[PDB]
Amino acid sequence: LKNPPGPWGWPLIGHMLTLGKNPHLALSRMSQQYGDVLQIRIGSTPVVVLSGLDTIRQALVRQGDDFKGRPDLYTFTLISNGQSMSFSPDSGPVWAARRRLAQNGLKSFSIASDPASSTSCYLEEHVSKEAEVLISTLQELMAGPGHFNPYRYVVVSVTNVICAICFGRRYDHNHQELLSLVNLNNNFGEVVGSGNPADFIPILRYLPNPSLNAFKDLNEKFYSFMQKMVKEHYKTFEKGHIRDITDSLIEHCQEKLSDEKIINIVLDLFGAGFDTVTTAISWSLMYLVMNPRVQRKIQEELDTVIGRSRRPRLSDRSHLPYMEAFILETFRHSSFVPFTIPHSTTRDTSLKGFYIPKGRCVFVNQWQINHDQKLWVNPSEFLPERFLTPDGAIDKVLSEKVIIFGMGKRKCIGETIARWEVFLFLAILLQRVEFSVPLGVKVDMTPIYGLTMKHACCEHFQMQLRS
Length: 467
Ligand code: HEM
Ligand SMILES: C[C@H](CCC(=O)NCCC[N+](C)(C)CCCS(=O)(=O)[O-])[C@H]1CC[C@H]2[C@@H]3[C@H](O)C[C@@H]4C[C@H](O)CC[C@]4(C)[C@H]3C[C@H](O)[C@]12C
Ligand SMILES: O=C(c1cc2cc(F)ccc2[nH]1)N1C[C@@H](CCl)c2c1ccc1occc21
Prior knowledge:
Layout: H1 16-19, H2 23-34, E1 37-42, E2 45-50, H3 53-62, H4 74-77, H5 93-111, H6 122-143, H7 150-167, H8 176-182, H9 188-192, H10 197-200, H11 203-206, H12 210-234, H13 245-254, H14 259-263, H15 265-290, H16 292-305, H17 321-334, E3 343-344, E4 349-351, E5 354-356, E6 361-364, H18 366-371, H19 396-399, H20 415-432, E7 433-436, E8 462-465
Parallel strand pairs: 2-6
Antiparallel strand pairs: 1-2, 3-6, 4-5, 7-8
Helix pairs in contact: 5-13, 6-7, 6-20, 7-15, 15-16, 15-17, 15-20
The structure holds protoporphyrin IX containing FE, 3-[(3-cholamidopropyl)dimethylammonio]-1-propanesulfonate and the ligand O=C(c1cc2cc(F)ccc2[nH]1)N1C[C@@H](CCl)c2c1ccc1occc21.
PDB class: oxidoreductase
Keywords: CYP1A1, Duocarmycin
Assembly: monomeric
């Protein structure tokens, strides 16, 4: 048919300099000229970059089986001993079977009803517990220091939820086992983010690379923690009393695809679990602090729809259209997952009249959709009201153009869990407390590129109870 178009690139390094430190911004300007299917080169490796709401739906959904593979990148082979469900090049029926195990394991210990509490489910019970511990920890910080860095304590509250779902345990707010793994050891996004030169320039792996060495250690540390957590569950495993997702995977090793590819699925769940949800909640607090106008509106809605006599529940999610418009605009404006995990073609295929051979690396630019000047009014501006119709309800036609959970056969499997976890944490907190940042302190809202885009650490947040 045709080869996908693209700008001129150096014969040796390709367009690696055009990408720069923000490949999502460069490839969004590039799509304005070369279209929804364009081709670049990182070093000598060709890469196809998909942009556009309809073209990405055409490729990942309607032709999903043509794009459901992962490329064979170097950085991916360092994840979970090279056998990760999400990052391994395996995309046949072996992957499809592991994905179905994860989906069923999640539904059982997140959305399913809790035997302990008749009213709520597992997720609502865990989030309610951790949101109270979080509010108490922040009250203690206002008793002394008078300020705090939220990420340090949100990451614990969010980890205790996904950790209770995967290992049936929780940890205190000041635990060295936990913070070592999750905090200040998470350059996973920085190393795995699409366009990493080390994947396409083979010499950068062997040179002095401080980030790549800390990455090998982070994974080796996590894989050891998994072995400790699974061996301890195997030592007390009772068939019939399934405590968490780990037990249902142990149960599935005895009921019949190696045992390692079954057990290390919790590493993908635990990993994606705390990294994305913590990033999302962290960004939310930044926007509430920089836009006190919209924090006041979220609270005026909570006071009308729920009052202050009872904690918000999952049932209230559909009766709070402004809270959902805020969370949607946090996902759209930040786009803290600017690219999906890189895809790969499983066969010679055709897309919008362009030929893509088998094995071609494929990037999916979610950031471009969420800031397309043709789909949005003031994309650079943070304006939650853009999702509200004239009668104050969520515009469903427009809200389903916020692409951040992926699409197709490789779509996020914890999407529904993240939307409820994010809603509850924000709803329970903003009902009780009000966050702020004093004047005259810098608050760098600039995203830092990575698989999940984080922000500069802010240590000046404050919190007060409400009347
Ligand atoms: C706001 C929160 C989250 C966002 C924005 C998000 C986004 C994404 C994206 C963009 C992908 C890749 C899509 C693709 O490759 O086409 C993905 C995959 C995945 N997500 Fe999520 N995610 C979130 C939360 C979660 C949670 C809470 C879990 C589990 C507890 C989870 C588990 C996974 C897994 C296992 C994959 C790999 C799927 C595969 O490789 O087929 N994610 N997510
Ligand atoms: C640490 C090992 C665990 C080895 C084990 O038991 N491995 C079973 C796993 C095999 N499966 C997964 C197939 C079982 C599935 C069961 S299913 O129901 O699924 O069929 C278990 C097995 C024997 C246990 C000791 C004795 O008790 C004596 C004593 C009991 C008291 O309390 C105080 C503790 C003490 C010292 C115990 C310590 C420890 O606790 C031991 C060494
Ligand atoms: O799978 C993921 C993941 C993050 C993420 C973010 C997204 F926005 C969308 C999809 C995603 N997936 N992670 C992250 C990391 C824990 Cl920080 C980690 C794994 C997996 C196996 C691992 O072994 C040792 C560490 C480790």
